[PDB]
Structure 1
Amino acid sequence: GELQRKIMEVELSVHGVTHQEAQTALGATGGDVVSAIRNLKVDQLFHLSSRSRADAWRILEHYQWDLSAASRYVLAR
């Protein structure tokens, strides 16, 4: 149904996210897939960059919400 489809969409939209993390994120947004994906992308980048969560958000914005591009940026030496 809708809820299964939504959890799958979240999990497939964010590299590295588990099914459990997708469910938790979507529960926190009341089933709003777009907000769950945003929050999970920030989370993933935050854990990869060990920056502040607001700085991870700012990097994601600079990369036009592309987590792959933002992640390659934070990992570049």
Structure 2
Amino acid sequence: IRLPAHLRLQPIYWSRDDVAQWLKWAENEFSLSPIDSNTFEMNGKALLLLTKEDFRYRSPHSGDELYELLQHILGGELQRKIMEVELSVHGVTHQEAQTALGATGGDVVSAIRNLKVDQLFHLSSRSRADAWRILEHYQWDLSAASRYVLARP
């Protein structure tokens, strides 16, 4: 039906109060069994990281419904992807994560690798093929690849 204010923002901006308000909205809109407000004590970012099994454990009556709503109706899937990209590539901005996912078609794996080469390339005068060499050499661990180039004699 109609989503309330604040619930219209992306889930990554949902506060812990917004999440409780979301649960209330879904309960009334979908005639769910009463959901205790202390069932998801976390903000919208955390919410996106729970698995479907986690939603079922926390709400046996409605967990799977809530997951599908959040992830596949309210845009949770893309926001989980951008958050994984941003957290897998230190130094990446949120806007940059969105841009890289779009540039790879929602392929999280390609987007992370593309940003890792960008980040390592940014640390020195070495070329992009040099940065690729060090990343491949270090099994795409950006932390170790970075320290290799920073600690050269």
Shorter-chain TM range is over 0.9
Q: Distance in 2 between matches of 1:50 and 1:37?
A: 22
Give the TM-score normalised by the residue count of structure 1.
0.96
Give the TM-score normalised by the residue count of structure 2.
0.49
3-state SS in 1 of match to 2:139: coil
Q: Distance in 2 between matches of 1:14 and 1:50?
A: 20
3-state SS in 1 of match to 2:140: coil
How far apart are 1:64 and its partner, in Å?
1.0
How far apart are 1:9 and its partner, in Å?
0.4
How far apart are 1:68 and its partner, in Å?
0.4
Q: Distance in 2 between matches of 1:66 and 1:23?
A: 21
Structure 1 unmatched runs, 5+: none
Q: Deviations over 1:18-64 (max 9, x none)?
A: 00110110000010000000000000000012211111011100011
Q: Is the 8 A contact 1:10 1:22 kept in 2?
A: yes
**More moved, 22-31 vs 47-56:** 47-56
Q: Distance in 2 between matches of 1:15 and 1:37?
A: 10
Higher relative contact order (CA 8 A, sep 6+): 1
Percent of residue pairs bearing the same amino acid type: 100
Q: Distance in 2 between matches of 1:30 and 1:8?
A: 16
Q: Distance in 2 between matches of 1:57 and 1:4?
A: 27
* Count of aligned pairs between the two proteins: 77
Q: Is the 8 A contact 1:14 1:41 kept in 2?
A: yes
User: What is the Cα-based RMSD across aligned positions, in Å?
Assistant: 0.8
Q: Distance in 2 between matches of 1:49 and 1:2?
A: 35
Q: Is the 8 A contact 1:49 1:56 kept in 2?
A: no
Q: Distance in 1 between matches of 2:94 and 2:125?
A: 23
Runs of 4+ in 1 over 4 A off after TM superposition: none
3-state SS in 2 of match to 1:49: coil
Structure 2 unmatched runs, 5+: 1-75
